[PDB]
Design an enzyme around this catalytic site. Sequence first.
Site, short mmCIF file in Angstrom:
data_model
loop_
_atom_site.label_atom_id
_atom_site.label_comp_id
_atom_site.label_asym_id
_atom_site.label_seq_id
_atom_site.Cartn_x
_atom_site.Cartn_y
_atom_site.Cartn_z
N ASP A 72 42.73 30.01 49.50
CA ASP A 72 42.21 31.36 49.29
C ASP A 72 42.51 32.25 50.49
O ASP A 72 43.12 31.81 51.47
CB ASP A 72 40.70 31.33 49.02
CG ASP A 72 40.35 30.90 47.61
OD1 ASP A 72 41.24 30.85 46.74
OD2 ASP A 72 39.16 30.60 47.36
N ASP A 77 30.43 28.59 46.72
CA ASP A 77 29.84 27.34 47.17
C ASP A 77 29.21 26.55 46.04
O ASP A 77 29.22 25.32 46.08
CB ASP A 77 28.79 27.62 48.26
CG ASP A 77 28.36 26.37 49.00
OD1 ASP A 77 29.01 25.32 48.84
OD2 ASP A 77 27.36 26.43 49.74
N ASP A 122 33.13 25.48 43.26
CA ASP A 122 34.29 24.60 43.40
C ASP A 122 34.12 23.50 44.44
O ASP A 122 34.79 22.47 44.33
CB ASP A 122 35.54 25.43 43.74
CG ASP A 122 35.31 26.41 44.88
OD1 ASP A 122 34.51 26.10 45.78
OD2 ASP A 122 35.93 27.49 44.87
N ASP A 154 58.63 37.30 45.39
CA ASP A 154 59.16 37.88 44.16
C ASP A 154 59.74 36.81 43.24
O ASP A 154 60.09 37.09 42.10
CB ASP A 154 60.22 38.94 44.49
CG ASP A 154 61.28 38.42 45.44
OD1 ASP A 154 61.13 37.29 45.95
OD2 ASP A 154 62.28 39.14 45.68
N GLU A 155 59.84 35.59 43.76
CA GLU A 155 60.32 34.44 42.99
C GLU A 155 59.24 33.38 42.80
O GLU A 155 59.56 32.21 42.57
CB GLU A 155 61.55 33.83 43.67
CG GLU A 155 62.68 34.81 43.93
CD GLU A 155 63.74 34.24 44.85
OE1 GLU A 155 63.50 33.16 45.45
OE2 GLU A 155 64.81 34.86 44.99
N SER A 159 57.65 31.76 48.06
CA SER A 159 58.75 31.37 48.93
C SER A 159 59.24 32.55 49.76
O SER A 159 58.89 32.68 50.94
CB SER A 159 59.91 30.80 48.11
OG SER A 159 60.96 30.34 48.94
N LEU A 171 63.86 25.07 40.08
CA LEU A 171 62.89 24.09 39.60
C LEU A 171 62.56 24.36 38.14
O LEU A 171 62.31 25.50 37.75
CB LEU A 171 61.62 24.13 40.44
CG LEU A 171 61.70 23.56 41.85
CD1 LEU A 171 60.51 24.02 42.68
CD2 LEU A 171 61.76 22.04 41.80
N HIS A 207 71.29 27.73 40.59
CA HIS A 207 70.09 27.39 39.86
C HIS A 207 70.43 26.62 38.59
O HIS A 207 71.49 26.81 37.98
CB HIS A 207 69.29 28.65 39.51
CG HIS A 207 68.95 29.50 40.69
ND1 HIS A 207 68.42 30.77 40.57
CD2 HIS A 207 69.05 29.27 42.02
CE1 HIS A 207 68.22 31.28 41.77
NE2 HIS A 207 68.59 30.39 42.67
N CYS A 266 65.21 42.16 36.77
CA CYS A 266 64.03 42.10 35.93
C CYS A 266 63.40 40.71 35.96
O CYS A 266 64.00 39.74 35.50
CB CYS A 266 64.37 42.48 34.49
SG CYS A 266 64.87 44.21 34.27
#
Lengths: 579, 570
Positions: free
Chosen positions: B133, B138, B141, B292-293, B312, B332, B393, B552
Amino acid sequence: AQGTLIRVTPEQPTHAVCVLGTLTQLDICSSAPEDCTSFSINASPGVVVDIAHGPSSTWPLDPGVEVTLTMKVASGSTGDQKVQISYYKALLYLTGVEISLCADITRTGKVKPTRAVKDQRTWTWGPCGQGAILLVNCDRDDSEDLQDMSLMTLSTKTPKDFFTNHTLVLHVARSEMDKVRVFQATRGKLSSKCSVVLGPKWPSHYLMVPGGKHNMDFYVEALAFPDTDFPGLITLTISLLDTSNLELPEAVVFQDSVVFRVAPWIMTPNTQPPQEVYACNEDFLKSVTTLAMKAKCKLTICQDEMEIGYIQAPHKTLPVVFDSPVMGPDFGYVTRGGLDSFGNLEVSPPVTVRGKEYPLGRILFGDSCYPSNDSRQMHQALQDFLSAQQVQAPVKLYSDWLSVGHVDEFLSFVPAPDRKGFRLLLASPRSCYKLFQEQQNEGHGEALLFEQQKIKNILSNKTLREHNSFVERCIDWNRELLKRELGLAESDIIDIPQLFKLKEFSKAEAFFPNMVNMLVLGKHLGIPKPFGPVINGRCCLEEKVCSLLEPLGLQCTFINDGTNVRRKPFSFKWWNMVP
Amino acid sequence: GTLIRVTPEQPTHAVCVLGTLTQLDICSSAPEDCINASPGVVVDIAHLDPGVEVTLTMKVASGSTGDQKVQISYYGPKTPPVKALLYLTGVEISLCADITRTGKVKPTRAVKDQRTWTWGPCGQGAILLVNCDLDSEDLQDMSLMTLSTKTPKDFFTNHTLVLHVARSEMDKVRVFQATSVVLGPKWPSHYLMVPGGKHNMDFYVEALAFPDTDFPGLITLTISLLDTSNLELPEAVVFQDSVVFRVAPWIMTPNTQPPQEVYACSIFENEDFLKSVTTLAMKAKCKLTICDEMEIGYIQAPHKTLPVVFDSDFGYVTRGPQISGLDSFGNLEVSPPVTVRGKEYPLGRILFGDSCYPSNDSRQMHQALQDFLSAQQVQAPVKLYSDWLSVGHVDEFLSFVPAPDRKGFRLLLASPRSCYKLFQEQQNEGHGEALLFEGIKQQKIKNILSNKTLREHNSFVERCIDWNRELLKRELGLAESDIIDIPQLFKLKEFSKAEAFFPNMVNMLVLGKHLGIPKPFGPVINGRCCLEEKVCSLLEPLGLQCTFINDCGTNVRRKPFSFKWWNMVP
């Protein structure tokens, strides 16, 4: 475990190169005419077409006609065999080769073919498994050199035109290159001008193997021991590269793999036969010489900071000395990775606890109980080292109430002919008081101890009696811990009298010299001189231990007052264990 | 076990924690050679003959120190009857958590062996969530472990309780006290002050690090009882109980899972795209967000499933590259639930790109990312072959779509062969001079069909997709009927890498059954494009309603699995 996909087309010929031992499938519904459902396969003598239907040969061309093209031999000329896919005609030319990579996979110590179970794809723990074993060079900075290396043979059987448009590459993954070193042998002689091909600087080498039958040998060696970052597995690989056109990048056709595991470091307990004593007071030295002569073991004159273990491989077993900051041609110093000294380490005899069997014993070291500001603990790196080598699992005992902090101050293992075979000796501040009280009741209450006080003062010093209590509730906790991870009953725990005096920083130190830190040379024993009361000729203190150890068969000598002992490796071999 | 040694000279005292074996040794100090039990104790024997083990058990925790008494009598004709008096005290100490993995604190009345963690459909262990976070977060979680003690009110003036975490796992755990930290990254040990009577102390637990190369993910917290009866002497330990925890791994979601929310970063110049993606949002229901990825996943514990984002609440995870062209997150992909040679991966397999054999230009993923994704044994990596591409990729030639028959998923691999088949069959039936690349060179179909330099480049590429096809077939345990071959075309360029000829179609947006697909600007035949009919006739029978966009980045969050990860057995 790979297969090819030869997609045949009926308007132009197709050429293929299949490696025997690969499930070759000939896919048909690729360029077939839109009409018709009856193709058939007219084969050639050198190809076995084991066509089956979905789970001449007028077969319905429904989607799912699996066709297999297993063959027999290695071609002596390109396009030796032929295949026709009629459509009522597709042509297929075919040539074959034999590439293999076979190391000692069945752990028999030979050059066994890679045709063993599961080939060489994964290492499997247990007495029924596959995978070769490598050694770390126990060396510091021909036949003798190759006596401690494996042998990977690359057998190539190709026609005499095959390697004008094809090649091979040998490669190791870039993450593991610093941990392997592959030498190469010229065909002139088994040991003739060997130079490195792969190592920590060049992870891929382009071989040149002439066509025709040719089997050439690599030697392989490791460069590091198992540790946190290094689980223990290396993977070497061959790859066939096609380079028909000299204007386009190469492509991959065949990839065979072999897996290796690096042999770990195993220690030797006190219950094993001796082989040599590397000795470093002249009376003590003479006593050690007498003890060795009575045990017919080799004694050498030139220190508890090293333990002579061994590394075991299917071909050779090599002693190794590990010391925290005698040579010959075979020893080597591990350079991997008070409480952090090497005295806080003992390996237990063979035991079986909670059903699961530990044939090689369990390693035992000491630490604190609740981490605090003034708690001394073993260095974490060495703990992770001794836990990374999983053949001997770690066991953590309680040694932080001692000034020295070592573990050998209150436990030791001895041989035995009956029951299990090994006897655990624990220092006990309790039996000595009982012996002294019994001697006082027998009539002797002014004896001369440390001849220095009398037995009366020792049996009437209230502070000492209160001190030995706390030094008795800690050995008891260690006892309960040792009776849970080694599966020991109450009959295999002999108590050796040894008093303690809590005086230094409220820590523990012995009163008279320790009788638990002994020297075991096979069946024979050497025990430190326990100065004590001389009651009726013999001393009372040196009587309890004798009467407790002699009936087993063990002898006990009493040296007036640091020699390392090498012991034979285990007959059980670690690759048969199942951790 | 707790061996108690009684002496025939003076009475002995002892404190026992209920539920633990308590043998007493009697042959050791017996004069010569050859037991009255109070209501509060039970004495049993099962083979002063050496080796006669005798054990004591309690019924309830004591009310005052030394209320229950055990007298051992050495009756003897020659030696007058001797007696050994043992004044026992009984206390109850329990430290329990979610060991049986239901969701309750599960008060353990000495029923479970909470000192081990085992993968399995049913077993023992506790799950701990990461803190990617105190008045809130409290009660939600942070895991709860409770400490219950029944002791006399005049008992903790002498005995003290401590709680300790090992010093090798202290930068990865934090423990709060119910109304405040007691243990964490600076204090291995805390000295609790528990009054007498009964007192249920509530302890909240959080983690600070995902499983990685050096962390196998197993935190152990232990309680110790210390006897401070004397002040000059140091204390000794009498009882130790522990609870083992495992850190919840980072799991990724494959394509087949129905969407929950669809995100985007459209700002300007998108135009039609936005409308089109919005149209999908209404047809296949999704909540469509807009500014952005990164890649979205989740972490699961028996009290909460939390969506997380790998870059990343949402939070972030950063344990990899503390980068070449292959370390982006388009490299991935996750396979749907799979079965391989008997062994079932119910949560799928990660697929990542890497070269075949190392060389001077064998661009590979940073080893940190690979080892991080292999530390999570939930979804084991599979190494593909994606070096021949410029971008590199694996999303540029493979993708999974949800199928309603057979296995359940369709793997769509690009195939240069089928496009030649389309064009050849088209010219075999006339109109073999149709235009192509109508967007924005308007090369004729004839010129593409007769070219003598594109064929070599496509042949080499077809020699590369086959290897990955065989690798996938072996690793994922597929058959021939689950692989569709979408027509695509490739062309080698400078530095000898492969790029798509006309825009690719394998990178498709899957909103459940709905499929957003970028447009093959190509031939105009009969009125509808041929590249727009092979895909239709190959996909629509599944029920997927294909749509064509004019591309995009649109990241899609997908609903978490049904099969829980603790039930897996790796």
